[PDB]
Design a protein around this ligand. Structure first.
Ligand SMILES: Nc1ccc2oc(=O)ccc2c1
Ligand SMILES: Nc1ccc2oc(=O)ccc2c1
Lengths: 268, 269
């Protein structure tokens, strides 16, 4: 991979692996989400930020501040097959005092056609107290020279799906998968649950018949609180409709919300 | 990746990814085991066998026969760090009528040093009845031209760890992790649990204090029966031992049917 000519975005190619594909012989959405994290990490490394997934500055490090994902939105038009080469381009852009955004564009390396798009919203948090805070002018000014100055959005369209508010699923859920728990493979280098694991957990409560007859086109996931290494999660889903679903992940005991989301599926 | 000059082995390089590393900033043993499967699959593709992980011939496909893993043995001297390039070489060799063997050697691409090695034993099974059978002379003769004709072993030493018999853990286990179940990410393209998931499940019952103070050097795992997509597994471990050694058992949560047994060897950091 490498920074592009202008130094304001990063590109990397990946060859889809045998164990990365699902029943359609194409990459799963969790494989795509892991590749988006990998290219984001390589971009932060190339310009001197931390490589732990938080992309912090030296000033954020003294204040014990990190960036944490608030929302992930992914739209896939075509999943790459085993052995195919996919090129992913990524960039960031600050969003005032609210937080920051990392966007991605996925292309088929042979045709050059856009096969998918993603956008993520991040907020600043103290790593110890877990308290959110608005971004200071000093921190935002430090990142400006690593981002495009004019707006550059993976989802430019008006009233597009990526910014829609997600409601809270009401009990009883139509479908559920209970007692989900992370294993060591679900943890990152800092022993926290990888953000992609929550996408897997949301998808566990979609009935197998939908997975067998449809393809996932869009997923929007809000992150509210972490699942700790010793927590247990219930995944709930209700049809709201293409087939569309509303999702909720909550801690198995007390029912504390950890994530909410929506998915849109196209019949094969 | 590519077949080597003589066409009897396959090599492929991999750059270690951010999400593939553990608490030491080096690749986990499950990441290494997934790379071993990937290079095995690319080798089978390059010479015309199936690419579903079973590496079958046309004759095997007619008889509804597949190769299934009976044992996996991995020894790691150094785990590659994030961003490092590791080169893996793999080859197969038939083992008479018993089954076949796939071996691997892992090297650091910059130094050329051997950083690990692995060997796996496979048996032939009818896909539908799940009945094992000996390998016919016709099938073994079909694979001979794709293997070295003189012995080539990743573990040549006498009485080496890779061929040792593993005993059955007796209750009560010293440690356990109960109620493990696969999710869709644990399944392969044919909706079966990926062999690497069982390595993860064995390791779940090792106490966190061992993982925090030791490095896994050797793992030997026997595969007896599959975990189905709707099954639930219990992982049991007992210390048998500077090095720490453990005996492992995976069994179905309800009736206690054995699915795997294994041993691990760990060295203090
Ligand atoms: N606001 C902001 C935050 C994190 C960033 O990390 C990068 O790797 C490049 C740009 C960037 C911008
Ligand atoms: N006996 C045996 C079985 C499977 C094999 O698959 C390969 O990809 C190359 C050689 C080989 C040999």
């Amino acid at each position: 991979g490498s920074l592009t000519e202008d130094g304001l975005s990063y590109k990397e190619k990946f060859v889809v692996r045998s164990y990365e594909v699902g029943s359609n012989k194409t990459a799963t959405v969790e494989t795509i989400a892991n590749l988006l994290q990998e290219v984001g990490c390589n971009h932060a490394q190339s310009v001197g930020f931390s490589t732990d997934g938080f992309a912090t500055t030296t000033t954020m490090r003294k204040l014990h501040l990190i960036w944490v994902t608030a929302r992930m939105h992914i739209e896939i038009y075509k999943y790459p097959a085993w052995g195919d080469v996919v090129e992913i381009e990524t960039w960031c852009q600050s969003e005032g005092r609210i937080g920051t955004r990392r966007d991605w564009i996925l292309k088929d390396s042979v045709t050059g056609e856009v096969t998918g798009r993603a956008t993520s919203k991040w907020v600043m948090m103290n790593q110890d107290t877990r308290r959110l805070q608005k971004v200071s002018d000093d921190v935002r000014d430090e990142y400006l020279v690593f981002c495009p100055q004019e707006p550059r959005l993976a989802f430019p369209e008006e009233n597009n799906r990526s910014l829609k508010k997600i409601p809270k699923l009401e009990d009883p859920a139509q479908y559920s998968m209970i007692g989900l728990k992370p294993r060591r493979a679900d943890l990152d280098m800092n022993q926290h649950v990888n953000n992609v694991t929550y996408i897997g957990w949301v998808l566990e409560s979609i009935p197998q018949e939908i997975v067998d007859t449809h393809e996932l086109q869009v997923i929007t996931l809000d992150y509210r609180r972490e699942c700790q290494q010793d927590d247990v999660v219930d995944s709930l889903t209700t049809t709201t409709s293409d087939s569309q679903f509303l999702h909720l992940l909550r801690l198995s005991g007390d029912g504390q919300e950890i994530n909410r989301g929506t998915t849109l599926w196209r019949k094969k």
